[PDB]
From a paper:
F1 domain of ATP synthase is a rotary ATPase complex in which rotation of central γ-subunit proceeds in 120° steps against a surrounding α3β3 fueled by ATP hydrolysis. Upon dissociation from the Fo domain, the F1 domain can catalyze the reverse reaction, i.e. hydrolysis of ATP driven by rotation of the central γ subunit inside the cylinder comprising α3β3. The catalytic sites are located at interface between the α and β subunit in each catalytic dimer. Here we describe catalytic intermediates of the F1 domain in FoF1 synthase from Bacillus PS3 sp. during ATP mediated rotation captured using cryo-EM.
The two F1 domain 80° structures were obtained from 56 k particles using an αDβD covering mask. The two 80° structures shared the canonical asymmetric hexamer which adopts the closed αTβT, closed αDβD, and open αEβE conformation. The angle of the γ subunits in the two 80° structures relative to the 0° structure were 81° and 83°, respectively. The nucleotide bound to the αDβD differed between the two structures. In the αDβD of the 81° structure, ATP was identified at the catalytic site (left) and we termed the structure as 81°. Notably, the αDβD in 81° has the most closed conformation, adopting a slightly more open conformation in the following post-hyd. In the αDβD of 81°, the γ-phosphate of ATP interacts with β/Glu190 and β/Arg192 residues, and the adenine ring interacts with the β/Tyr341 in the CT domain. Therefore, ATP bound to the catalytic site of αDβD stabilizes the closed conformation of the β subunit. In both 81° and post-hyd, ATP and Pi were identified at the catalytic sites of αEβE. The overall structures of αTβT and αEβE in the 81° and post-hyd states are mostly identical, but the αDβD structures differ slightly.
Author numbering:
A (entry chain G): 230 to 284
B (entry chain A): 24 to 501
C (entry chain B): 24 to 377
D (entry chain E): 1 to 470
E (entry chain D): 232 to 471
F (entry chain F): 353 to 471
The structure:
Amino acid sequence: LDAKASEHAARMTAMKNATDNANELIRTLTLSYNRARQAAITQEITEIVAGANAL
Amino acid sequence: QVSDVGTVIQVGDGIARAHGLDNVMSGELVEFANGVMGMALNLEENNVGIVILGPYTGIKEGDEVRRTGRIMEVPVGEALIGRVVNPLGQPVDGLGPVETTETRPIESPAPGVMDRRSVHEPLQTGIKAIDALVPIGRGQRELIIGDRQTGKTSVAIDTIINQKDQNMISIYVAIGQKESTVRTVVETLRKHGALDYTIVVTASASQPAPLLFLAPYAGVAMGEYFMYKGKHVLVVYDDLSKQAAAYRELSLLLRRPPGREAYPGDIFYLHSRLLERAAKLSDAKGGGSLTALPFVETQAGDISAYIPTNVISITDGQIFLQSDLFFSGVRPAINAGLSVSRVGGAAQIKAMKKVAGTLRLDLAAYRELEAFAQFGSDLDKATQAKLARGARTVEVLKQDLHQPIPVEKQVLIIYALTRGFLDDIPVEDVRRFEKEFYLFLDQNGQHLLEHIRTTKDLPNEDDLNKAIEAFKKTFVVS
Amino acid sequence: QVSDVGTVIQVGDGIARAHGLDNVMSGELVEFANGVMGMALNLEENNVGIVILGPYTGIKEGDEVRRTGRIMEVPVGEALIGRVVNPLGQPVDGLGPVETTETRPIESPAPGVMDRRSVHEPLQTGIKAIDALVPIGRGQRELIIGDRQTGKTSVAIDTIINQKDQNMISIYVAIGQKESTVRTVVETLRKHGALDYTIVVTASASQPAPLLFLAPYAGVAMGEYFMYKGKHVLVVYDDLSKQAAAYRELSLLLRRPPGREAYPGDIFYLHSRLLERAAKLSDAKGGGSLTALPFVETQAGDISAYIPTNVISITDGQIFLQSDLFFSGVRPAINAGLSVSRVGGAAQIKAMKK
Amino acid sequence: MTRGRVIQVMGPVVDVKFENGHLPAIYNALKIQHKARNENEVDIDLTLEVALHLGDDTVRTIAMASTDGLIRGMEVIDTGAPISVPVGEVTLGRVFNVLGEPIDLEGDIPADARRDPIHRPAPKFEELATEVEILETGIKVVDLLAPYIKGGKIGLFGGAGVGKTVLIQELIHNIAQEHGGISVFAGVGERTREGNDLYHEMKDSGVISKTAMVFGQMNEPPGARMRVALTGLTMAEYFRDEQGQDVLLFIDNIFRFTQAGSEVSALLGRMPSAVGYQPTLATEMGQLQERITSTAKGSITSIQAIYVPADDYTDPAPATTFSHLDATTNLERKLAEMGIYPAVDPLASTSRALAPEIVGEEHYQVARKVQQTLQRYKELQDIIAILGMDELSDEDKLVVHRARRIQFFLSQNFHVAEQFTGQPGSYVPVKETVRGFKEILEGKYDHLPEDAFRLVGRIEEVVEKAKAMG
Amino acid sequence: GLTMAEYFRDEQGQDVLLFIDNIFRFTQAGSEVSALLGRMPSAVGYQPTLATEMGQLQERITSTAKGSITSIQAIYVPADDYTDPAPATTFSHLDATTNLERKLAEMGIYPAVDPLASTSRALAPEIVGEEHYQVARKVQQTLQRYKELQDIIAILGMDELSDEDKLVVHRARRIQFFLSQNFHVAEQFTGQPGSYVPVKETVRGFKEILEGKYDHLPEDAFRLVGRIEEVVEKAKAMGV
Amino acid sequence: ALAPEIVGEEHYQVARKVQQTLQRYKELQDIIAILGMDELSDEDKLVVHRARRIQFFLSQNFHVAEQFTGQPGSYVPVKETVRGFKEILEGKYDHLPEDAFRLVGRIEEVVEKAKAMGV
Ligand SMILES: Nc1ncnc2c1ncn2[C@@H]1O[C@H](COP(=O)(O)OP(=O)(O)OP(=O)(O)O)[C@@H](O)[C@H]1O
Ligand SMILES: Nc1ncnc2c1ncn2[C@@H]1O[C@H](COP(=O)(O)OP(=O)(O)OP(=O)(O)O)[C@@H](O)[C@H]1O
Ligand SMILES: Nc1ncnc2c1ncn2[C@@H]1O[C@H](COP(=O)(O)OP(=O)(O)OP(=O)(O)O)[C@@H](O)[C@H]1O
Ligand SMILES: [Mg+2]
Ligand SMILES: [Mg+2]
């Protein structure tokens, strides 16, 4: 009984820690994704305008 | 020496630049020497930029172009019903001329603030999910947005078909599609009987860009004729993205300054002009209304692109369709979590409003608290009740092709679901339960059906329970 | 005769073009018909490119432009202490004219390699965290970097206030800030008695971009006036990101090809010019010093962005203020892991550094 | 000389040539009034705004309406001043467009009324207020957790059916009742159906007589959608400067203002900024916002509804807009469904003014304690769901007991909500709500039922409701 | 080539097969010269007349009352990005669509047809049959369910999956492997000869696999096999 | 210059082994990021154990850095570096704490500071 209780508590704690780590990783990846999206828009518009005014 | 004539200087890519035309107006029609027509968009200091509305291979530098003195306009009338037509008002199916005795300009002011009335009449599309969770009212403009091969055209066709027994005139605008696909759509509509009240406007991929640019406005004018006559019109735009691309092509050929993603600066103004002409008119100038269902095709589910964001901002609501939902077995594929209707409940009958609230909460409490199903297999907490209710709701919301459901039958089945009469029928049998319940209704519940159709309200709950139990004792579960 | 008189050809978006002005020199001040100042930027073969340092609505093509004969300059002196002025030296507090008697150029070379000395005198900011972990010396250039609403302005104000009993001149330059916030800052300084040794230079968000571009250079010139006279000066640039944005705007309106994040190619040189003037002079040059505390506003704590990286590459260290640590009740949110002083410790007193 | 001629038309952009030496100034308004000379012409009534001086006596302008039917060489006249809109008591209860002409059918404003220029510089440094002053709104949650500041800018975030319109109407009513200040609503990029519904709702609620409405519709050109905010601000500045009142300004969506500016820049041909925006994004935002300030004789406070593109708060438009905000209000559909009105999120909402230096030590302590208790209750939600509340320790149960009562007491009965509930409304002073929350925190009303806190004003009303319940 | 085919379609009323080696090269060549022609660039550097030219070319390839042309075209996808403007515009011109993904190619499955993204107007109950429609839909549903499980499998392992999801993976892997085939022209790459599988036989085999008759067979026995008979015979070579 | 005929056979082998262990640790870092070191097999746990100590021993205290941290710098011969890294790869110092490998020069200083701390 003591072993089963300890196993359940350990599983609960490990899953809580894993969930927190996954949430933090999601936040960092979202920040990086937004920066990449802004950079892509900047590059495409710069190329568009350079080609347009190169005539 | 006269100022009503000019000579062409440059020809190419579907546009022409002509010297002269001193007194030409902005947006006026012009006629070339060989007989083709054009529209004057750019009025520079010494030349006029003209977009050509036909084959430009016959136009050469130095030939003559003449004024017409009138703005672009299209024929309007009841003679267009049952016809498939180009944006210029010329038939494309043969079958003879159109015989229309009236015209209407393409560009017209939208109804003012004081000319309108609050949206209060439902638009029954025959789709359970749309009618229950994202209501559409007469005069509302609702965006239908999703990826390719998801069912937007099927939704539009079902909505058009469902308008048979209602005093509604439908207009279908096909932009940039294959003429074969348009022919197939027209054939399906003819088979289901929609050509008695439907008009089709086509601007295929082989047509010049200005025709694709002008097609939705021609559809809007044709709808506005009936709207100002006092009737109700439904207008569908099968792709606004292709029209925007055609306008972008014209603007880039005319050497106008490009904006984000090469689109011109007035691309938002174009779509706002187009979609602002759908309205619900006040009783002071007739109760007619025009409702619009624009389409937008997203790329890899990206709703943050320029045109999707513009149309989402402009419209009164969005219906999102998902490919994973489509492939998971949810054929309507409507994402109720993201789909939103900003006029909702003003566009529903009382019977539907009295069950839609419970249905929405059940669906939400399933969609969140999902992913517990695998661990809910190990029965815990009695959350399995919510899980089973959500699964049965999802099974109920499924629907087949070209089979719209009457609003009274939708209300009855949603009442049966929300009151717990399906809790002992397994999810595998919900479709059969609904299919046989409709027949049981039209056999032995004509009083309930007539009561709903007349009073727009639910019948007595005791009688409803009696009928449902009577059917349920005869339904065999397997 | 168009030697000292010009005529405007084009006006728009704060940039004008003039015909004539044959004798004008590059970087000269010009005066418009309505009294608005301008700077001669480009000397083309036929026309002159002029940057308007003020409201350009009253300037119309065909107006008269005349030479001033002076390189772009600002007034300096002791009469400027205790006053709030614009980047052109015009008072805005409403206390009357400023009686300065000499001027200094806005563009001036930095002290040479042999004109400097190692930093060895402590600048006591009065904040325990900074004075312990990130010591600041007189002549050092320390960056203050963090997100919005994290306490950079409070740190700067406390540092300025702490100099009450120390022989220091303080200059507060606010680029792109709100006028109400600048008014409250001035009121707090007046209440704590810092106006006896403080000069405030302001260029709000509603001002044209050239004024925001010019403000830090006016501040550093005002500081250099005292610095080269043997005194010690502290200069605070409340936001260099606003100046960078204004300069990017001006470059794009000049149709110069943008680069990373649409910034021009000389955005690094823009800040290097400004920050290379702060130095510790040698005994042969007088022993004066100028201390700079530039500010940079990051987005979501991204310290690896283009402008933050450029500013880090110039200064002598940085103090990082962390947003989530600030919201956790540690109001002086110094992130000790990412904060360092490269020339500190040599200035820290012996008692503190053990 | 004041006569020009149209020389070039390309979409919403029109170039006009003038006589040498008589060019119009920047931002000046030009008028085109043409009658069809023959069958091949159409009547024109169009207004233009000067944007650039291209040289050779030519001026580039942006149209405020459609340019269809324009003919090169037609006459243009210069008004000699920027756009001017009527100001004063005549603007109350009326709906205007960007030109200042009334949209409603109540008649036109006489030409003898005073009119003010749309473009003007911000108030000078020495005309501003020297201290920060709190604006009492009468709403408990706002006055406690996210205090408003006279002359400050407040961002508004919420869902479709949270109740933003009801909150706006209640703010208008409370300010007009207790401070004597009018409000101005600026419909930047307003849908016509939404504008009609809003007008009818204002007329039904009765706050129409204390407000002036300016609508810039979606189907209007980018110039009009740019200048609607400025004309609303001009209408508010009259009441700030002349009557000395404390005025409220509402903006439909400032993101549409920034997008209209970007579209205008693209049409003018200026090179795009980092993420495709105009180079002058910060300058335009500062010019708009810096006029909303508190002066020695009055103040204007502004409520902005802000759209975040792609949910990215690092995007340049939200990043520039957030630099001017002083507070933030978030509305929650969870609270709306739970029955909490106003549906203001007690944890997500933030305010710069919640500092002991300006709001008071007791107020700050009470607000912090309330937020801490609600955060603890939010933390305990999952364990309360999984296991019965009895399993919680006595301290946790006491925390939940306090927190539910506090959450219910955050609600309030609005004056404009009588049309929904039949019961009247309440105006709660900030000191009253602070004292009430302090008493609730001290356990004075632990024995009262939680439904007595549902919708009341003063703390005494909870006691009265409990006594009536028995 | 199009006009050569059009002559036969119109004048003789023959049935014509039109094969195009790569239709994306037409778009690429059109874009290579737009800047020299003097046109301002479009979004991704393409010519402004991209959609117009593509439609003017594609709309001539159609079946009429005088004759029918069925055309099979290979369409290149630059950098595997299906959101590229050329494939995005090309998608609207087709009736049946086959998508190839290199994720299946890296795993050794050929012809590596994506079982979900591939669409056809002919997949309808009245066109192909009710049993065929239902078995195809069940296969698609099983594969869609499998695709979601990979993300959690790659982290938490198969041991944490429920008994239902374990069976779903077990059958989905076998279905995906049986989707492979050996082509006659693939002898140079596989050694073994090709095969020809009729629609009735493949429907029957996929129905059996969906029912789970061959759960005990190893998953490797389904690689490039043709029918299920060859699967069960190839299993004998491994001693199963 | 990292070639067997230039630096020596044992030098090349030690460098290659160190690079291999570091690559394996870099591959595992994704799994340790989410679910920690508990689910790693006995081989991967030993790889992490060796890789952390190797990475810390790659640090050094510089003479110039004496102005920033008061510690004096060190100069390490390449033969001593090779011997130390070979010993760490062989598992001689698996029992020492990983914080004893930071900012030291020769492998003897690791033992000295581990003895200075608790051991
Ligand atoms: N409710 C449904 N039940 C069964 N099949 C459906 C249903 N809705 C759509 N489909 C099928 O799914 C496919 C979607 O085709 P549809 O033309 O409706 O999509 P679309 O989004 O307009 O695509 P596109 O224009 O890109 O071809 C068709 O094969 C259609 O028959
Ligand atoms: N040490 C402190 N103790 C308490 N409150 C503080 C402290 N430092 C700053 N604050 C408060 O925190 C807030 C931070 O504002 P501050 O102007 O100092 O920051 P900032 O980074 O310059 O912000 P912004 O971008 O708005 O200019 C202010 O309300 C200020 O009063
Ligand atoms: N204080 C309140 N008391 C009672 N009911 C309220 C209150 N606030 C909102 N409601 C209810 O919620 C509904 C939605 O409110 P409201 O019309 O203000 O929405 P909204 O969020 O402003 O809308 P939108 O985003 O569409 O402009 C109201 O019609 C009313 O039924
Ligand atoms: Mg379709
Ligand atoms: Mg600050």
